[PDB]
Design a protein around this nucleic acid. Structure first.
Length: 87
DNA sequence: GTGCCTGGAGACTAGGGAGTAATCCCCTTGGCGGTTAAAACGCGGGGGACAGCGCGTACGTGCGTTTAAGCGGTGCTAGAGCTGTCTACGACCAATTGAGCGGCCTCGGCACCGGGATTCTCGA
């Protein structure tokens, strides 16, 4: 059952990652950088969408990097050289 | 569907950009020779690309379990507008000055060029 989840999560054009643990994470990083700040939920789902787009871009860049080095399972070095062509 | 508040539409008068005369004029585009360092043809090769095998392991997959965690309510709490009210607050045209450009003249280490001392050959 390899092609089942690829045709399921891609066609369903909604989100997949969590919201309230991501709210706890953004509260953690604002405790790291700032003083508590109130956060609009539209801003939290915008950060969620931007993180999702950045992650799917990084994984679709490492997809061909896996098959380039005669591999299928991606490695830790694949998330060390895909950043070189991402800044 | 119904609707009232307000940006949109628009002509008249000062008032500042546009492209057409005008002319330098500097940069460029085009070609002739030379000479030379780089581009091209070829040839043996060997070191690196590539197919295949050994393997083992660790993730593909499945199952018991917990584990937050999601959907719905609602008060608690504390952060986002809006109209008054008053203060600052940055610009406009003009005399005076200024300070960095147009074109000029002075140094100074780098590469080339000649003597003092040293070494090599012959002569005395």
């Amino acid at each position: 059952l390899a092609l089942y989840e690829i045709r399921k999560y891609q066609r369903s054009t909604d989100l997949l990652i969590s919201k309230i643990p991501f709210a706890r994470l953004v509260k953690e990083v604002t405790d790291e950088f700032t003083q508590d700040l109130r956060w609009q939920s539209m801003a939290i789902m915008a950060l969620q969408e931007a993180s999702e787009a950045y992650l799917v871009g990084l994984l679709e860049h490492t997809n061909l990097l896996a098959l380039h080095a005669k591999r299928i399972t991606i490695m830790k070095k694949d998330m060390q050289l895909a950043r070189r062509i991402r800044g």
